[PDB]
Design an enzyme around this catalytic site. Structure first.
Site, PDB file in Angstrom:
ATOM      1  N   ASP A   1       4.109  -0.914  -2.597  1.00  0.00           N
ATOM      2  CA  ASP A   1       4.610   0.229  -3.345  1.00  0.00           C
ATOM      3  C   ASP A   1       6.104   0.095  -3.640  1.00  0.00           C
ATOM      4  OD1 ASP A   1       4.957   2.683  -4.587  1.00  0.00           O
ATOM      5  OD2 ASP A   1       4.731   3.865  -2.737  1.00  0.00           O
TER       6      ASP A   1
ATOM      7  N   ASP B   1       7.087   0.768 -10.768  1.00  0.00           N
ATOM      8  CA  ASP B   1       6.374   1.370  -9.644  1.00  0.00           C
ATOM      9  C   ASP B   1       4.967   0.793  -9.478  1.00  0.00           C
ATOM     10  OD1 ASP B   1       5.423   2.918  -7.553  1.00  0.00           O
ATOM     11  OD2 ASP B   1       5.499   4.833  -8.661  1.00  0.00           O
TER      12      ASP B   1
HETATM   13  C1  ZR7 Z   1      -2.313  -0.391  -9.091  1.00  0.00           C
HETATM   14  O1  ZR7 Z   1      -3.023   0.849  -9.048  1.00  0.00           O
HETATM   15  C2  ZR7 Z   1      -2.803   1.693  -8.037  1.00  0.00           C
HETATM   16  C3  ZR7 Z   1      -1.510   1.703  -7.391  1.00  0.00           C
HETATM   17  N1  ZR7 Z   1      -1.308   2.532  -6.394  1.00  0.00           N
HETATM   18  C4  ZR7 Z   1      -2.325   3.345  -6.012  1.00  0.00           C
HETATM   19  C5  ZR7 Z   1      -2.112   4.268  -4.906  1.00  0.00           C
HETATM   20  O2  ZR7 Z   1      -3.065   4.780  -4.366  1.00  0.00           O
HETATM   21  N2  ZR7 Z   1      -0.813   4.536  -4.597  1.00  0.00           N
HETATM   22  C6  ZR7 Z   1      -0.331   5.368  -3.598  1.00  0.00           C
HETATM   23  C7  ZR7 Z   1      -1.108   5.978  -2.570  1.00  0.00           C
HETATM   24  C8  ZR7 Z   1      -0.523   6.941  -1.741  1.00  0.00           C
HETATM   25  C9  ZR7 Z   1       0.801   7.277  -1.949  1.00  0.00           C
HETATM   26  F1  ZR7 Z   1       1.293   8.184  -1.153  1.00  0.00           F
HETATM   27  C10 ZR7 Z   1       1.621   6.668  -2.982  1.00  0.00           C
HETATM   28  C11 ZR7 Z   1       3.064   7.137  -3.251  1.00  0.00           C
HETATM   29  C12 ZR7 Z   1       3.964   7.337  -1.976  1.00  0.00           C
HETATM   30  N3  ZR7 Z   1       4.924   8.347  -2.407  1.00  0.00           N
HETATM   31  C13 ZR7 Z   1       6.044   8.699  -1.674  1.00  0.00           C
HETATM   32  N4  ZR7 Z   1       6.223   8.099  -0.412  1.00  0.00           N
HETATM   33  C14 ZR7 Z   1       7.336   8.482   0.259  1.00  0.00           C
HETATM   34  C15 ZR7 Z   1       8.240   9.441  -0.295  1.00  0.00           C
HETATM   35  F2  ZR7 Z   1       9.315   9.762   0.307  1.00  0.00           F
HETATM   36  C16 ZR7 Z   1       7.986  10.019  -1.544  1.00  0.00           C
HETATM   37  N5  ZR7 Z   1       6.904   9.664  -2.248  1.00  0.00           N
HETATM   38  C17 ZR7 Z   1       4.523   9.008  -3.657  1.00  0.00           C
HETATM   39  C18 ZR7 Z   1       3.087   8.561  -3.854  1.00  0.00           C
HETATM   40  C19 ZR7 Z   1       2.581   8.617  -5.296  1.00  0.00           C
HETATM   41  S1  ZR7 Z   1       3.467   7.512  -6.425  1.00  0.00           S
HETATM   42  C20 ZR7 Z   1       3.932   6.166  -5.311  1.00  0.00           C
HETATM   43  N6  ZR7 Z   1       4.572   5.127  -5.954  1.00  0.00           N
HETATM   44  N7  ZR7 Z   1       3.731   6.097  -4.028  1.00  0.00           N
HETATM   45  C21 ZR7 Z   1       1.008   5.698  -3.777  1.00  0.00           C
HETATM   46  C22 ZR7 Z   1      -3.574   3.339  -6.640  1.00  0.00           C
HETATM   47  N8  ZR7 Z   1      -3.804   2.501  -7.661  1.00  0.00           N
END
Ligand code: ZR7
EC number: 3.4.23.46
Length: 390
Positions: free
Chosen positions: A37, A233
């Site tokens: 991530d 991202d």
């Molecule tokens: C290539 O296709 C994909 C890519 N990724 C996924 C996926 O399930 N991503 C995912 C799962 C849980 C999650 F919490 C996150 C976070 C962690 N976040 C966070 N963490 C700490 C913080 F202080 C503030 N926000 C915000 C949150 C939504 S956007 C992101 N970039 N990361 C991403 C699915 N399909």
């Protein structure tokens, strides 16, 4: 030449479910699959039983575990996790041959965090300390890695989308791409790398200076494209655009593809569309170009993706041989997010040492014989710093 054979093909997963790398935590090593991530900055792992976890971090079984005696609470838009801060020894088996003592959030409660059948048990936040929880004093994993070892302050990502659906069995057996820690592997791209400045070290923030749909300028004030930020991202599926940009882009994409009519639910990302096997009309859908600020004054370059990137393959609701897709461009109220939709087109170099992001055409991007993804330049662009939102 490929100079990082040990790390090529070390990622698994897909868009929608996420790309993950194998890591080990603790002594003796506990193996976990960890979501990559670039949009967050915490290293956090499942540390208690959960319906969707086949395994989790057991701190009691690790002789090297250290309790920091501090809770962490991480609410976000579509869910939350909370847990307990500690440190432990961490390695990446298909990575540099190093072991680091890193901060680890042991997740004890979560809502809508873990995905059923994704095959990952935690998250590797690769962005900067500014956005770390609880605050910027919790050193992110990559900063620990660089401080404690001789690993260069750079990583690169090739995310490989399949272009067709992968079921439970197929995602496990398949290669989903590469994370090259500490370098650039020449076998992962074709053509030249073009670099955009990292505007500020929090997210991987960049500046978009122009948007085209099939060569046609969207013609918005460039500040709109970066309102209130633009980020790269790997932890987001979609290309996400600010509301006004989304409205303008979708109107233009509809016009370009107007030889076929799609329901509103398709454009909203809610509804799939299906075509008879092999007949997806790629050619009716436009290419999308994002122009990024160059490293040289008054220079820009562009990255161009195909519908093969922004239409996401999905398994049919009524099982058939039809090829089915969802539209993976969507509205944002938090700025532009260049998610897996962009990243699957490109080899992306996170050059932290030189405060810049590199883009090159991915050797694994999905295309047809008529069109490919492109990275091209230079272009003469003016007043580009003005495109940044304050
Ligand atoms: C290539 O296709 C994909 C890519 N990724 C996924 C996926 O399930 N991503 C995912 C799962 C849980 C999650 F919490 C996150 C976070 C962690 N976040 C966070 N963490 C700490 C913080 F202080 C503030 N926000 C915000 C949150 C939504 S956007 C992101 N970039 N990361 C991403 C699915 N399909």
């Amino acid at each position: 030449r490929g100079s990082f054979v040990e790390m090529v093909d070390n990622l698994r997963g897909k868009s929608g479910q996420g790309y993950y790398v194998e890591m080990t935590v603790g002594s003796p090593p506990q193996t976990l699959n960890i979501l990559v991530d670039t949009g967050s900055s915490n290293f956090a792992v499942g540390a208690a039983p959960h319906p969707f976890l086949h395994r989790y971090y057991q701190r009691q079984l690790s002789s090297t575990y250290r309790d920091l005696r501090k809770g962490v609470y991480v609410p976000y838009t579509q869910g939350k996790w909370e847990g307990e801060l500690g440190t432990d020894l961490v390695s990446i088996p298909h990575g540099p041959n190093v072991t680091v003592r890193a901060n680890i959030a042991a997740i004890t409660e979560s809502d809508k965090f873990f995905i059923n059948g994704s095959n990952w048990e935690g998250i590797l936040g690769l962005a900067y300390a500014e956005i770390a929880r609880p605050d910027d004093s919790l050193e992110p994993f990559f900063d620990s890695l660089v401080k404690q070892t001789h690993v260069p302050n750079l990583f690169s990502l090739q995310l490989c989308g399949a272009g067709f659906p992968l079921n439970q069995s197929e995602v496990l057996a398949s290669v989903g791409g590469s994370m090259i820690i500490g370098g650039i592997d020449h076998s992962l791209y074709t053509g030249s790398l073009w670099y955009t400045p990292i505007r500020r070290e929090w997210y991987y923030e960049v500046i978009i200076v122009r948007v085209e749909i099939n060569g046609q300028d969207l013609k918005m004030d460039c500040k709109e494209y970066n309102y209130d930020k633009s980020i790269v991202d790997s932890g987001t599926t979609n290309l996400r655009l600010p509301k006004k940009v989304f409205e303008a882009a979708v109107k233009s994409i509809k016009a370009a593809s107007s030889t076929e009519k799609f329901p509103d639910g398709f454009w909203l990302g809610e509804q799939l569309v299906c075509w008879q096997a092999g007949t997806t009309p790629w050619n009716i859908f436009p290419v999308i170009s994002l122009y990024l600020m160059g490293e040289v004054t008054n220079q820009s370059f562009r990255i161009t993706i195909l519908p093969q990137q922004y239409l996401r393959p999905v398994e049919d609701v009524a099982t058939s041989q039809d090829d089915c897709y969802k539209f993976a461009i969507s509205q944002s109220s938090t700025g532009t997010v260049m998610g897996a939709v962009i990243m699957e087109g490109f080899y992306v170099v996170f050059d932290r040492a030189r405060k810049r992001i590199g883009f090159a055409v991915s050797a694994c991007h999905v295309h047809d014989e008529f069109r490919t993804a492109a990275v091209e330049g230079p272009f003469v662009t003016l007043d580009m710093e003005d495109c940044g939102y304050n």
